[PDB]
Amino acid sequence: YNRMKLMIVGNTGSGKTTLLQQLMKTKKSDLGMQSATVGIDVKDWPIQIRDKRKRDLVLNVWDFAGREEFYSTHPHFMTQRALYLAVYDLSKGQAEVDAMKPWLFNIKARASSSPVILVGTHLDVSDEKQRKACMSKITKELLNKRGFPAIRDYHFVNATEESDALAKLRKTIINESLNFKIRDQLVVGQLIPD
Ligand SMILES: Nc1nc2c(ncn2[C@@H]2O[C@H](COP(=O)(O)OP(=O)(O)O)[C@@H](O)[C@H]2O)c(=O)[nH]1
């Protein structure tokens, strides 16, 4: 059972829809101005893994509307066998760290584990000054110690494009999932009934 969960969260406007669609291999000549999610949905992410012998990993990725009605009201989505990814809007500079700061409300309040990364979206419409302010504040606040072990890393991603912008995220998430253990049991590779 090579399955693990992932929570994709952020404040609406951060661009999660485009990010996940490009990560799922959508392309061009389609709607640019994509809609925003309501509710909390889930999709499978079967990302092939290689070695001298082929491997795989399928994530249960949870699509959370970046709206309070689908966050502060649903604490039961926090778990310890999931990775966490924040979709961060770079066009607001460091102001977005302050905007994400309150998400502790569910993340610390209810036991959770293995946060991994922040994804800096809107790279293409953000200033260098903003990106510098972002990484400065992200580090100052979150990577130092949001209030819980938010102490991980980030990538600034041109989410509209694939390239390295997305390859870096796929590599980061799979490498963490693939090596994550809960109660010393690798999540990706359990022996279960049925
Ligand atoms: N320029 C640019 N636009 C983006 C990017 N990512 C997504 N989009 C915008 O994201 C909008 C969708 O809103 P969204 O925040 O994903 O709603 P949510 O599901 O509540 O989080 C789309 O209409 C696009 O205009 C990006 O990195 N660059």
Numbering used by the authors: 1332 to 1525
From the reporting publication:
Leucine-rich repeat kinase 2 (LRRK2) is one of the most commonly mutated genes in familial Parkinson’s disease (PD). In vitro, the catalytic half of LRRK2 alone can bind to microtubules. Here, we report cryo-EM structures of microtubule-bound filaments formed by LRRK2RCKW.
Unlike WT LRRK2RCKW and LRRK2RCKW-G2019S, LRRK2RCKW-I2020T showed this additional layer line in the absence of MLi-2 as well. Given these observations, we chose the LRRK2RCKW-I2020T filaments that formed in the presence of MLi-2 for our cryo-EM work. In contrast, our cryo-EM map showed clear density connecting LRRK2RCKW and the microtubule. The fact that microtubules are directional polymers, with ‘+’ (fast-growing) and ‘–’ (slow-growing) ends, means that the ROC domains, which would otherwise be related by a twofold symmetry axis perpendicular to the microtubule, are in different local environments. The higher resolution of our map, and our ability to process LRRK2RCKW monomers individually, allowed us to circumvent the symmetry mismatch between the LRRK2 filaments and the microtubule, and show that LRRK2RCKW monomers related by (pseudo) twofold symmetry in the filament are indeed not truly symmetric and interact with the microtubule differently. A sequence alignment of LRRK1 and LRRK2 revealed several basic patches in LRRK2’s ROC domain that are not well conserved in LRRK1. The patches correspond to residues 1356–1359 (KTKK in human LRRK2), 1383–1386 (KRKR in human LRRK2), and 1499–1502 (KLRK in human LRRK2). In our highest resolution maps, in which we refined individual LRRK2RCKW monomers in the filament and their contacts with the microtubule, the strongest density connecting LRRK2RCKW to tubulin involves the 1356–1359 and 1383–1386 basic patches.
